[PDB]
Amino acid sequence: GPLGSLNIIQGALELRTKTVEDVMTPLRDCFMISGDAILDFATMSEIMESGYTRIPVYEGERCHIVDLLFVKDLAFVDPDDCTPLKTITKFYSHPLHFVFNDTKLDAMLEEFKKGKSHLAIVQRVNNPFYEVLGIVTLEDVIEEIIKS
Amino acid sequence: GPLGSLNIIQGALELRTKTVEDVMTPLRDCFMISGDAILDFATMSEIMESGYTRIPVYEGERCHIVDLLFVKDLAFVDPDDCTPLKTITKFYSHPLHFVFNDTKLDAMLEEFKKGKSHLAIVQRVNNEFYEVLGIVTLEDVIEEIIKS
Structure with a gap:
């Protein structure tokens, strides 16, 4: 209790x-999924099964x-149509947030708390190109708080 | 920053x-969804749109x-089949956790951390039977911690 x-x-x-x-x-x-993806039954099945x-x-x-x-974006996608995935990503255009690896978690939590988004991409300056290393979620940050 | x-x-x-x-x-x-539900295209769409x-x-x-x-259980459900929802709930049988309303948040967080589940139902002892009032998620608990 109190120790936690x-x-x-x-x-x-x-x-x-x-x-x-x-x-x-x-x-x-x-x-992740390729932008070339076709939203047939098989493709949407892996999206949902992934959790x-x-x-x-x-x-x-x-x-x-x-x-x-987002998984909610498939609410009106019929697999028989073979709708290309790029069509749905253009339609909703959920904001994509990029951050540098040097960002501290307190600043990360402040950025996540301000916006509805829970995901951000970690990129590092390569030495003159941008190097993407991974993604960090809000759930990833909160784990550090409650971890023993 | 530090105030947070x-x-x-x-x-x-x-x-x-x-x-x-x-x-x-x-x-x-x-x-919530009724156990009588049939997993046709319209029903599965409302589950996903809810977020x-x-x-x-x-x-x-x-x-x-x-x-x-869970949304991931629909990975192999074809809406043309009209699979009843009780079939999928029987198949996976995700654990359903009930708790009392007097439970303190410190004890609640400990229960969620131990198990994979993130959902619990709030019930109160009725005196005049078990009285269910609502549900509480892990997201509700961590919000109170980080709330300003």
Whole structure:
């Protein structure tokens, strides 16, 4: 009981020192879908079976994330139509947020609390190109607070 | 910034005094589905559009919650088949957790951390039978911690 609330307090202190790179999901392990996808029955089945609700969309390379698909966006998609996925990502255009790996978790929580979004992409400056490393969710940050 | 870390500490103290009744969702405002439901195209669409991933299932009265439907269970459900919902709830049998309204938030967070489930039903001892008032999610508890 109180020992658990103590760990919460310790996590609220760790937030000012931990970066989003520490708690993110690496790109090699992120469940994503290609923009070339056709929303037939088989494709939508993997989206739902994955358990995720916010799935990054990439074009060509897995590091080129261009859109964000929500599971609620498939509410009016009939698999018999073979609707291309790019059509639905254009229609809803859910905001896609990018952040640097050096971002601290307290600033990350402040950015997540202000907006409805719960997902952000971790990218690092390569040395003159942008290098995407992974994604970090709001649920990823809150784990650090309550973890013992 | 640092002021936000204060609210976590204040919430980390307040949770030991707040009951699940204060932060729950009342049954009159809970998105639920009847066990008689047929998983045709129209029904599956309403589940997805709601944005929820864990939807309580009731039999007869809305206060008689008997099962819990996840969105991922529809991965292999063809709307043309008209598969009854009870078939899927029997197949997976996701655990349904009930708690008393007098339960404090510190004890509630401990129960959610131990199990994979993120949903619980708030019931109160009626004196004049079991009186169900609403449901409380893990998202309700962590909000009180981080709330300013």
